Amino acid sequence: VNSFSGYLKLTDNVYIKNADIVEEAKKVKPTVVVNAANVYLKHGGGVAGALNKATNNAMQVESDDYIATNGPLKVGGSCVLSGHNLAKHCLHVVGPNVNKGEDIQLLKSAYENFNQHEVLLAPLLSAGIFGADPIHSLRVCVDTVRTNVYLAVFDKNLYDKLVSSFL
Ligand SMILES: O=C(N[C@@H]1c2cccc(O)c2C[C@@H]1C(=O)O)c1ccc2[nH]c(CO)nc2c1
């Protein structure tokens, strides 16, 4: 038993809810919140900008030190950093950005990072301003992640569509 509330069970291990991931994080304080990162950890907009804003820019400060030491992530890759006031840890995961022309096949590799963590609060990778179909992202999530994932979906109208179209 865990503390996530109101989530709709999709599969053995995947649950979904219409909520702002930042607000979910603030309430739950999960062990791991997933950020929809880019390779430079520049948290400007979407999930990343919203999470970073809630940390008063501490996420960005930590991220800039990470990049200065280690260089950029790979598309499909990840790193574990602090969760600041939102979670114990933040797993920064880079899904492919269709609006930048990146290979959608890398979405499965991105979701594989979730399997290193027993339980996660997460967004659908590559969706929103990353340009991919959220219905596709949810399918890849369910078919790739084996650990327990609680998906927060910002847009209420998309959430209803994701549920109604789920196979
Ligand atoms: O961009 C965000 N989420 C993506 C998003 C956004 C809009 C339509 C979409 O189809 C999608 C798919 C993505 C998802 O739901 O995971 C996001 C999430 C929380 C936010 N809190 C604030 C505060 O101002 N801003 C936010 C932005």
Please identify, by atom number, the ligand 1 atom nearest to the C-alpha of residue 153.
15
Burial letters for 59-85: b for 16+ Cβ neighbours within 10 Å, e otherwise?
bbebbeebeeeeeebebbbbbebebbe
Instruction: Give the residue, out of 27, 35, 47, 159, with the most ligand 1 atoms within 8 A of its beta carbon, to mutate for a pocket test.
Output: 47
Cβ 128 under 6 angstroms from ligand 1: yes
Taking the CA of residue 154 as centre, how many other CA atoms within 13 Å lie in the half-sphere pointing to its CB?
Answer: 15
Cβ 50 under 6 angstroms from ligand 1: yes
By C-alpha distance, which of 121, 135, 122, 124 is closest to 167?
135
For the four alpha carbons of 44, 31, 157 and 102, in that order, the dihedral sign comes to positive
Residues 13, 148 contacting (CB under 8 angstroms): yes
Q: Is 141 in a helix, a strand, or coil?
A: helix
Q: Report residue 164 as tokens.
A: 């109604």
Expressed in angstroms and rounded, the spacing between residue 133 Cα and the centre of ligand 1 is 14
Q: Report residue 112 as tokens.
A: 């594989």
Question: What is the identity of the amino acid at 10?
Answer: L
Relative to beta strand 14-18, strand 148-153 is parallel
By C-alpha distance, which of 103, 51, 123, 127 is closest to 82?
51
Resolution, Å (one decimal): 1.0
For the four alpha carbons of 63, 90, 110 and 8, in that order, the dihedral sign comes to negative
Expressed in angstroms and rounded, the spacing between residue 3 Cα and the centre of ligand 1 is 22
Q: Report residue 131 as tokens.
A: 């340009």
Residues 6, 142 contacting (CB under 8 angstroms): no
How many other CB atoms are found less than 10 A from the CB of residue 158? Answer: 16
Expressed in angstroms and rounded, the spacing between residue 38 Cα and the centre of ligand 1 is 15
Expressed in angstroms and rounded, the spacing between residue 125 Cα and the centre of ligand 1 is 11
Whole-number Cα distances in Å, 77 to 57, 87, 95, 106: 23, 20, 8, 9
Expressed in angstroms and rounded, the spacing between residue 36 Cα and the centre of ligand 1 is 10
Residues 9, 165 contacting (CB under 8 angstroms): no
Domain boundaries, the chain: 14-151
CATH class for the domain made up of 14-151: alpha beta
Q: Report residue 67 as tokens.
A: 């990049």
DSSP state of 150: E
